[PDB]
Design a protein around this motif. Structure first.
Motif, PDB file in Angstrom:
ATOM      1  N   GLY A   1      -2.390  15.704  39.959  1.00 22.16           N
ATOM      2  CA  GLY A   1      -1.958  15.177  38.674  1.00 22.16           C
ATOM      3  C   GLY A   1      -3.015  14.384  37.928  1.00 22.16           C
ATOM      4  O   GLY A   1      -2.861  14.120  36.732  1.00 22.16           O
ATOM      5  N   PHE A   2      -4.090  13.992  38.603  1.00 23.34           N
ATOM      6  CA  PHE A   2      -5.039  13.053  38.014  1.00 23.34           C
ATOM      7  C   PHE A   2      -5.958  13.758  37.022  1.00 23.34           C
ATOM      8  O   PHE A   2      -6.420  14.875  37.275  1.00 23.34           O
ATOM      9  N   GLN A   3      -6.219  13.103  35.889  1.00 21.71           N
ATOM     10  CA  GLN A   3      -7.004  13.689  34.802  1.00 21.71           C
ATOM     11  C   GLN A   3      -8.487  13.428  35.041  1.00 21.71           C
ATOM     12  O   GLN A   3      -9.070  12.471  34.513  1.00 21.71           O
ATOM     13  N   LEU A   4      -9.107  14.303  35.829  1.00 20.09           N
ATOM     14  CA  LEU A   4     -10.544  14.241  36.019  1.00 20.09           C
ATOM     15  C   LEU A   4     -11.301  14.436  34.716  1.00 20.09           C
ATOM     16  O   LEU A   4     -12.399  13.900  34.574  1.00 20.09           O
ATOM     17  N   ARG A   5     -10.745  15.183  33.762  1.00 18.91           N
ATOM     18  CA  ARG A   5     -11.370  15.264  32.446  1.00 18.91           C
ATOM     19  C   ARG A   5     -11.514  13.881  31.827  1.00 18.91           C
ATOM     20  O   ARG A   5     -12.595  13.512  31.352  1.00 18.91           O
TER      21      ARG A   5
ATOM     22  N   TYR B   1     -19.831  16.104  35.471  1.00 24.30           N
ATOM     23  CA  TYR B   1     -18.908  17.118  34.983  1.00 24.30           C
ATOM     24  C   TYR B   1     -17.856  17.403  36.044  1.00 24.30           C
ATOM     25  O   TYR B   1     -18.082  17.222  37.243  1.00 24.30           O
ATOM     26  N   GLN B   2     -16.698  17.863  35.582  1.00 25.82           N
ATOM     27  CA  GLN B   2     -15.576  18.200  36.445  1.00 25.82           C
ATOM     28  C   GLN B   2     -15.816  19.562  37.083  1.00 25.82           C
ATOM     29  O   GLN B   2     -16.104  20.537  36.383  1.00 25.82           O
ATOM     30  N   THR B   3     -15.694  19.623  38.409  1.00 23.34           N
ATOM     31  CA  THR B   3     -15.906  20.861  39.147  1.00 23.34           C
ATOM     32  C   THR B   3     -14.618  21.500  39.639  1.00 23.34           C
ATOM     33  O   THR B   3     -14.628  22.680  40.002  1.00 23.34           O
ATOM     34  N   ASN B   4     -13.512  20.758  39.662  1.00 24.49           N
ATOM     35  CA  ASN B   4     -12.250  21.253  40.192  1.00 24.49           C
ATOM     36  C   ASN B   4     -11.113  20.463  39.555  1.00 24.49           C
ATOM     37  O   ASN B   4     -11.329  19.429  38.916  1.00 24.49           O
ATOM     38  N   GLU B   5      -9.888  20.963  39.729  1.00 26.09           N
ATOM     39  CA  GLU B   5      -8.730  20.276  39.168  1.00 26.09           C
ATOM     40  C   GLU B   5      -8.556  18.887  39.765  1.00 26.09           C
ATOM     41  O   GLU B   5      -7.903  18.032  39.156  1.00 26.09           O
TER      42      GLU B   5
END
Lengths: 254, 17, 580, 49, 145, 234, 216
Positions: free
Chosen positions: A118-122, A144-148
């Motif tokens: 659920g966490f917004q890595l974006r 940068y985000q690599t995964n959900e």
């Protein structure tokens, strides 16, 4: 309508409130005047609060009243529907650092991982990027985000103080971002491993555990584009502008 | 951590107006 | 080594695989997508919108996708909407998905996005009538200093819903205020001053191209105007100069093909009451018979409308009857009007009039009136959605022979294609009718299950050497590889039952193999079914009952009833074969 | 075999792509020959007591 | 009627698994042979027939396909017998031959060619994530003195 | 029915509840309203024991514990309250996770074991939880998880990539802490140590140690044959 | 005078008390008896803060502290409680000690870094200088400010006992300064590089977490 008279108190409740679960014995025992209940008035307070809100919070400190609440609710068979047989109540965040250290300069490449989706890595990446852009040039690092549920951050060979600043900022923003979601940092710890046999590479495993407590948008590609010295395209190349003749008049103001 | 004594202590003077 | 795949094979693998496998296939052939946005866009354009969205989501965490990819994805969504509009089977693209894709493109690029992408988003939100989303996009773009008249007209089309249609009216008002002449020019191009009953004859003769009238931009503007005029109440629809002008010029026009005239006229006049409709129609006929004016109970009315058409009798103005067919109060009344109405007599067999009648009766019942119409021996290309709804209604009626005969004598001719659920209902009717007879061969049922099936998606994968080349001379015209039809497990069960009732279980084996190959759709007890059909082909009842016993013992008691039903079906079929 | 297994990934993994991490395959030799092309660790035996 | 609708067995994916191509399905064949007869399963480099190749021929002729490939969860040495070697083969999904028939035809071909290898079992995979090697979590050998 | 007036509070209860022990001074003092000189606060515990048969004394309130015990000893009720596995969940739980991780360049391999200091922790439930959260995240062919004994769970992964190994470990720890806390605990502290192996160069062992204190949350809490012979055998 | 009713407890307070900050949505929540859905524990802290301009959050009760802070921020009162550059409610302090030695002379450099910017670090540098000028000569150690929210402290030639003095003094001053600024230490944890073989650098990474309890 319905009258309950417990040891030290009197309550008035709707037949509908009492019968919110009719088939249950709790409701069946009162088929539609003063009604006598042996249960403690404070136990009945929590039971009635659950009936009025459908949310039951057992008293943690007073394990006695907790025990009679459970006993009465089980004798009345309403506890089963009170609790049937999003985000998780605990969030474990892991960080793995690969560090290389020359004489006085240090580089770290760290991967950040969460325990749930659920966490917004974006949002976390955006927070880190904003808090690092005004402090140190993007030429020495990326994020940068690599995964959900995972994210990445790297730096190049840079002074030890600079590397410490970058990592401290990354962890500060990580904690702030995960607390913004309603999580308070319960525990944490850190570990540093020996360097590889023939290489100066070290591994630092850093863990946080959080317990659940409860306008202008910026365009930013996930994977960044590294910037060599000279621009390869004009300054305004990014923007697209509609034909001047095709342009139209404002519908709104301000 | 120093167990603060049961008395008025300096540094706690910020509390009083 | 000896064999090597080609881009066409990879695309066909993408088309066959489920939506989830998009990211894995992307990563396996990652050398194909990383630095060539051109063929990434080609893949998005050649695969459905769902797989395109999955592929973009996968590539998000690996590459830096540029705005061309989102442009191609929105274009593919628009093309899917167009194909479902042309066919009548599929479902329009979810406006939520379209808006999500546009917002993702904005968040990755923002101002770098074209305004053509904004147009595509507005047009993708139009079908669901998401006026709030249209207004949000308009505000976003104008704040970012990109507001444009095409966006304004598309937003008016989106906002034409009867909830806040005054907003669409205001949008068109501002659009005209900026472009004082575009709306009048579009209306007069729809009905040019010169064209008359003399010009229409030569226009319909069509011995020369004669490209003149509504320019494609005018056509899009006219479609937006059509939706806006359709959605408005009939008071303002005549009060406003624009709505009245559009209606008058649309009813009297021949620059549009009759099918387009039907679509636009029915949509525009959907909301009118009957008396006002008749008054307006008569006034327009009178003014047309007098010249051209520039602008910018039931039985008797039926007879007078027939006279309205018969007073000019142009072969072109056929759909004058279809419009009144749609406006007629009831389906029995529509059948009565058809009967009384009988070049005009030749117009009855036109597919449009029959489709209008079937549509009119479909809303109410379309059971007995539709049966009479089909038995009237006019096999034509009826709309797929209407035919599917009609067969669904008849299946609900629980009467097999009428469905079986109507299909076998009307549907298989004229190449009218049904839906998946309609095919399932028709196959159930076929099975029950053949059981009662214990006359459509299992081969015919197998052919119908595929040829008559109409999936909502479109085949788009051109063959390797047939794409418009960037070098050399293209030997062969671009040929599209027709995506293989996929069988539902329900349809597969009915096909197996039909084959076993009609005898040869090898047909059921073929159907099961085809379904497994095309979609990997394997029944929970396919092993037992295959063994049962195997022993049935060679007359082993003792082995069949042993298999039933073992299936009950292994899978469970409930799952054995299906196999036992197959046993009784086989026994009925072979016993009837011996007895006959 | 063990030297090759030491420098071996587990299954198929790709990770992200950036303009810095490019891995050109213009080796200058035939792709048909695979002798000596495997990634291998150098065998290292520790001392006995 | 509710018994005219056989229960089916969209598809979800886990980041790494066995992707079976759209035209093929994975079957499991368990086989057996004597090590003293077959020069082993398969040789990487070349300077009595290989069980792998003879089994491939038998399966191909039985299934009526030009060629098939078989990969075993275990590659026993030369001279090593196998009591039940479990391997899998990707065959077209349109054959629909019963395992009894497939094994019977393969046995007939092997007996004609006088190569003594037995096929214990042939069966479609309920879960198509099966891999004869990477899904085998234990291997049981016996040495008999 | 019966109305009991105590030093500061008024109560009404049932004669059968009062007479649940007919042989006691209770039933002797209530032979078919009354007043007692026991604190109203101390009275609720006794009344709840009679009505429910639970008399968990208050540890925080040492006084009221003392008066409850005194009154029950004077009236002969302590021998009934305390007449002479999940027997009891300890106030402090120590759980130790020992995992050998091998680390190559982009590769990571894990062999992890979870052990508890006490029984009654539904380790099978934890195993199912971890399987649920991992079988959707990566194929079971790579990883394996089961309970080796009571108090012990095991989690193996063959050679697996870096990011996915991180995901697997983070998920397993998430589930461990979630399960242990959800069953009635709260992580008082956590600390880890790291060792190099005596044999392999790229392997090391991490020892995580979590100390959980009971917190008594709001929501309810609970409180194949190996082969041996080849030839045919009789 | 108004009455505020919570889960199971009741309060009453002056309209002036409740309107001490009229612009606040908390103030507009009482437009001239009232019912609120917050726990009485959470409500008592905010009511006392309104009464006495006092705020001392419980660092020992994380649940209650988080509830109180979220309630006050959602009610627009937390900014009036902690007026400012805004200090975070949680701060992380990283103290990395790099140990080196060449030709038998062993040196080590401490680097302190704060997560946020609002901290005044020139004051910590001042305090450390004052507390170490007594313990040692400046010829053997040196502390300055590398940049905002980061400090450097080297020691080139220091005996074992003296280095033990320096480390503890620096940590004492760091923790005391940060806590005085209006924070309170929540957790502290450290790690070292085992590296039995010779290593060109040894690293002692110490981590502090500071949670906001008081103000100044």
């Amino acid at each position: 309508r319905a009258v309950i008279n417990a040891g030290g108190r009197r309550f008035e409740t709707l037949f509908s409130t009492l019968h919110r679960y009719p088939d249950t014995p709790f409701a069946q025992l009162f088929p539609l005047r003063e009604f006598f209940l042996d249960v403690t008035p404070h136990v009945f307070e929590y039971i009635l609060g659950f009936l009025r809100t459908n949310q039951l919070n057992l008293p943690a400190e007073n394990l006695q009243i907790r025990a009679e609440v459970v006993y009465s609710m089980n004798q009345w068979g309403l506890l089963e529907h009170a609790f049937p047989p999003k985000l998780p109540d605990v969030c474990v965040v892991q960080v793995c650092d690969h560090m290389q250290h020359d004489q006085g300069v240090k580089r770290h490449a760290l991967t950040i991982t969460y325990g749930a989706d659920g966490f917004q890595l974006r949002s976390l990446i955006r927070r880190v990027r904003r808090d690092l852009e005004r402090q140190l040039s993007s030429t020495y690092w990326q994020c940068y985000q690599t995964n959900e549920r995972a994210a990445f951050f790297v730096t190049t060979k840079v002074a030890n103080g600079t590397a410490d600043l970058l990592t401290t900022s990354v962890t500060q923003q990580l904690v702030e971002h995960t607390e913004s979601m309603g999580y308070s940092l319960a525990s944490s710890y850190v570990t540093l491993s020996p360097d590889v046999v023939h290489t100066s590479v070290r591994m630092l495993i850093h863990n946080f555990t959080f317990r659940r407590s409860r306008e202008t948008i910026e365009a930013e590609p996930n994977i960044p584009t590294m910037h060599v010295g000279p621009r390869r395209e004009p300054l305004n190349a990014a923007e697209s502008i509609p034909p001047r003749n095709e342009r139209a008049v404002n519908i709104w103001t301000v | 951590r120093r167990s603060r004594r049961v008395e008025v202590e300096p540094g706690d003077g910020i509390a009083l107006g | 080594a000896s064999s090597g795949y080609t881009f066409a094979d990879f695309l066909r693998r993408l088309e066959r695989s489920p939506d989830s496998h998009m990211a894995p296939l992307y990563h396996e052939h990652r050398e194909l997508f990383v630095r060539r946005h051109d063929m990434f866009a080609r893949v998005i354009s050649s695969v459905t919108w769902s797989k395109g969205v999955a592929l973009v989501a996968a590539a998000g965490y690996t590459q830096a996708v540029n705005v061309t990819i989102y442009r191609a994805l929105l274009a593919r969504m628009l093309l899917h909407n167009r194909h479902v509009r042309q066919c009548g089977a599929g479902s329009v693209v979810p406006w939520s998905a379209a808006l999500r894709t546009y917002s993702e493109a904005i968040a990755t690029h923002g101002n770098a996005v074209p305004t053509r992408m904004t147009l595509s988003a507005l047009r993708l939100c139009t079908p669901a009538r998401q006026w709030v989303a249209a207004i949000s996009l308009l505000m976003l773009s104008q704040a970012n200093d990109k507001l444009t008249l095409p966006m304004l007209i598309d937003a008016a089309g989106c906002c034409a819903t009867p909830a806040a249609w005054e907003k669409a009216m205001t949008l068109l008002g501002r659009f005209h205020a900026q472009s004082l002449q575009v709306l009048p020019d579009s209306i007069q191009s729809l009905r040019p001053v010169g064209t008359s009953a003399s010009t229409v004859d030569a226009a319909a003769h069509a011995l020369l191209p004669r490209s003149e009238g509504p320019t494609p931009e005018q056509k899009h503007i006219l479609t937006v105007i059509n939706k806006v005029v359709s959605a408005v109440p009939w008071q303002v629809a005549l009060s406003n100069e624009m709505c009245r002008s559009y209606l008058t010029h649309l009813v009297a026009s021949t620059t549009l093909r009759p099918t387009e005239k039907t679509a636009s006229l029915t949509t525009a006049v959907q909301q009118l009451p009957w008396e006002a409709f008749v008054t307006l129609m008569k006034t327009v006929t009178a003014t047309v018979q007098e010249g051209s004016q520039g602008v910018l109970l039931l039985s008797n009315s039926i007879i007078r409308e027939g006279v309205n058409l018969l007073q000019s009798e142009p072969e072109t103005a056929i759909p004058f009857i279809t419009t009144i067919l749609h406006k007629l109060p009831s389906a029995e009344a529509a059948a009565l009007f058809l009967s009384e109405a009988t070049v005009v007599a030749a117009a009855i067999r036109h597919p449009v009039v029959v489709g209008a009648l079937l549509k009119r009766c479909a809303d109410s019942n379309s059971w007995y009136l539709a049966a009479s119409i089909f038995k009237s021996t006019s096999p034509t290309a009826i709309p797929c959605d209407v035919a599917s709804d009609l067969v669904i209604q008849m299946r609900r009626a629980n009467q097999a022979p009428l469905v079986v005969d109507v299909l076998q004598k009307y549907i298989v001719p004229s190449r009218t294609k049904l839906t998946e659920e309609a095919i399932e209902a028709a196959l159930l009717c076929v099975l029950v009718h053949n059981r009662a007879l214990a006359g459509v061969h299992w081969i015919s049922a197998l052919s119908w299950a595929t040829d008559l099936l109409e999936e909502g998606v479109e085949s788009r994968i051109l063959q390797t050497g047939t794409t418009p080349s960037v070098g050399g001379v293209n030997h062969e015209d671009p040929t599209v590889l027709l995506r293989k039809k996929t069988l539902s497990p329900r349809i597969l069960s009915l096909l197996i039952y039909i084959c076993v009732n009609a005898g040869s279980p090898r047909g059921g084996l073929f159907a099961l193999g085809y379904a497994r190959t095309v979609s990997k759709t394997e029944l929970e007890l396919s092993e037992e079914i295959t063994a049962l059909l195997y022993c049935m082909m060679y007359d082993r009842p003792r082995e069949a009952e042993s298999i039933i016993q073992h299936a009950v013992k292994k899978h469970g008691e409930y799952k054995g009833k299906y196999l036992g039903r197959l046993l009784v079906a086989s026994q009925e079929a072979k016993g009837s074969a011996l007895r006959n | 075999a063990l030297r090759r297994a030491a420098m071996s990934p587990g299954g198929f993994s790709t990770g992200a792509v950036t303009e810095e991490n490019f891995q050109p395959k213009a080796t200058g030799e035939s792709h048909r020959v695979t002798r000596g092309k495997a990634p291998k660790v150098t065998m290292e035996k520790g001392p006995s007591n | 009627d509710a018994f005219l609708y056989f229960p089916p067995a969209n598809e979800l994916y886990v980041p790494g698994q066995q992707i079976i191509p759209p035209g093929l399905t994975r079957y499991r064949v368990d086989v057996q042979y004597q090590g003293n007869d077959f020069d082993g399963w398969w040789k990487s480099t070349t300077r009595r027939y290989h069980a792998r190749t003879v089994l491939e021929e038998a399966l191909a002729v039985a299934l009526d396909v030009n060629t098939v490939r078989v990969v075993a969860g275990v590659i026993p040495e030369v001279g090593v017998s196998v009591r039940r070697l479990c391997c899998h083969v990707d065959v077209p999904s349109h054959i629909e031959l019963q395992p009894r028939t497939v094994i019977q035809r393969a046995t007939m071909w092997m007996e004609k060619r006088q190569q003594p290898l037995a096929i214990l079992s042939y069966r479609r995979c309920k879960n198509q994530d099966f891999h004869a090697r990477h899904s085998g979590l234990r291997r049981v050998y016996v040495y008999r003195i």
